[PDB]
């Protein structure tokens, strides 16, 4: 098609949008997260800080149920006592920063639940192969 | 067996060989890719450059259909308009640098096709698990 336009859907462009809008574009935001006489030491410190953060996040994901995937389902049920808001209003209406400031108290508990469920899945997978 | 020789199949040793020859030895070439008062700053800059490149390649692989594997099939059909050369002549005759200089124009399009196919596979896997 001659006469072809383009919108350059850039890095960090679904902030105010709903969850299901940002779920499509999150991959490019994950992609742009990485690359980017004393001034070289400062830029070096900033660069190795950036890779310290990226490696921390990759390790923190890796002990959970997914190694390098970006979408990950697990076997831990959502405790309703945390936020008690149903599917449509959190998937269509609510933004991301609002969702961050809504459950910024039970985050570590969710981390521990994921880790415990993945470790018991590891031992169950190791014992499923025990009889074989 | 007494009297046992050895050829030390070292790093970067299948350059002029065919694709199927280098496909066996690629694992050691991937293994050797990583390790390796102002001179410490230069060597430090070179070392963190090397890990910047390695982490860029690991992230670029990870958003595709494989996380840490070295051989990877996907669900994107090979567009024949790119190179229109059949299986035997590209798997038995052609070298690697020739193969680089043959399709060094459609590489980014291949990257985008892989990323789009993997992301729609992500949403299809998430929706296959929706009804369960």
């Amino acid at each position, epitope marked *: 098609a*001659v006469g072809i*336009g*383009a919108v350059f859907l850039g890095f960090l462009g679904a902030a105010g949008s709903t969850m299901g809008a940002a779920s499509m574009t999150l*991959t490019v935001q994950a992609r742009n997260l990485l690359s980017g006489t004393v001034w070289g030491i400062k830029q070096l410190q900033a660069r190795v800080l950036a890779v310290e953060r990226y490696l921390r996040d990759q390790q923190l994901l890796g002990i959970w149920g997914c190694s390098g995937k970006l979408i990950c389902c697990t076997n831990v049920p959502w405790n309703s006592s945390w936020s008690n808001r149903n599917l449509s209003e959190i998937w269509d209406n609510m933004t991301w920063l609002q969702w961050d400031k809504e459950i910024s108290n039970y985050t570590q508990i969710i981390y521990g639940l994921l880790e415990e469920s993945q470790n018991q899945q590891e031992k169950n997978e190791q014992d499923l192969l025990a009889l074989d | 067996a007494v009297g046992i020789g050895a050829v030390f199949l070292g790093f970067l040793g299948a350059a002029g060989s065919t694709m199927g020859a280098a496909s066996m030895t690629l694992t050691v070439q991937a293994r050797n890719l990583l390790s390796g008062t102002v001179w410490g700053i230069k060597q430090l800059q070179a070392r963190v450059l090397a890990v910047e490149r390695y982490l860029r390649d690991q992230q670029l692989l990870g958003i595709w259909g494989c996380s840490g594997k070295l051989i990877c099939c996907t669900n994107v059909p090979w567009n024949s308009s790119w190179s229109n050369r059949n299986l035997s002549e590209i798997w038995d005759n052609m070298t690697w640098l020739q193969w680089d200089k043959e399709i060094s124009n459609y590489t980014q399009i291949i990257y985008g096709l892989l990323e789009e196919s993997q992301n729609q596979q992500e949403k299809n896997e998430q929706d296959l698990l929706a009804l369960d």
Partner: antibody
Amino acid sequence: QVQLQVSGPGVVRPSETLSLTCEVSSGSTSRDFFYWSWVRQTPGKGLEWIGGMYSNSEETNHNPSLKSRVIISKDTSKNEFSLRLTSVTAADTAVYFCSSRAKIYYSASYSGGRIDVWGPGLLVTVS
Amino acid sequence: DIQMTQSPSSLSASIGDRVTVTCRASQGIDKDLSWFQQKPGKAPTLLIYTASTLQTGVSSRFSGSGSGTDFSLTINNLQPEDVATYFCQQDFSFPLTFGGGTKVD
């Protein structure tokens, strides 16, 4: 007004200059570019594209069936897409739409989707 | 210019019929055909871009087939919101030529 809302005079005197404006907007990026286009809907014929121009450049691409009688201009600072059709006869009595022409691509390689939505038109009568 | 002929001008069907709009071209526009829905009095809104890809927002009822010069829009389970004039748009070469218009009653 809504996006791609065409406003201006609804009655053009015979053989004078029709001049219509349209509420356009910039993209989400400074790197973005639109093609704004004038299209007419006639009762006699179907939808007829009048012309248009890139938001990046100042070159005008138009339909030569109107025989280069258009002056297609824009002002991104003032949200203005403007048609100055000259020598307007009663054949140009039509409902004019102004259209945004762009693609929705997601990541820097591929195409991912094209959006060519139109805004509600303005009937211009020539008598 | 490239002539675009859309057929029919009007087609009548009951609630739930799979109808078909045929758009033919004079020249090779191979997959540069758009399908638009226009309420009477309102602006045309997009249904199909690149003649086979469903646009996000409209339902899966609007499907598209065909290639080259000949394309066919297909409406499975015809709805009361489908009362609209449909237009097939060529965007292969200058100028932009559009369809004749297909009314649903």
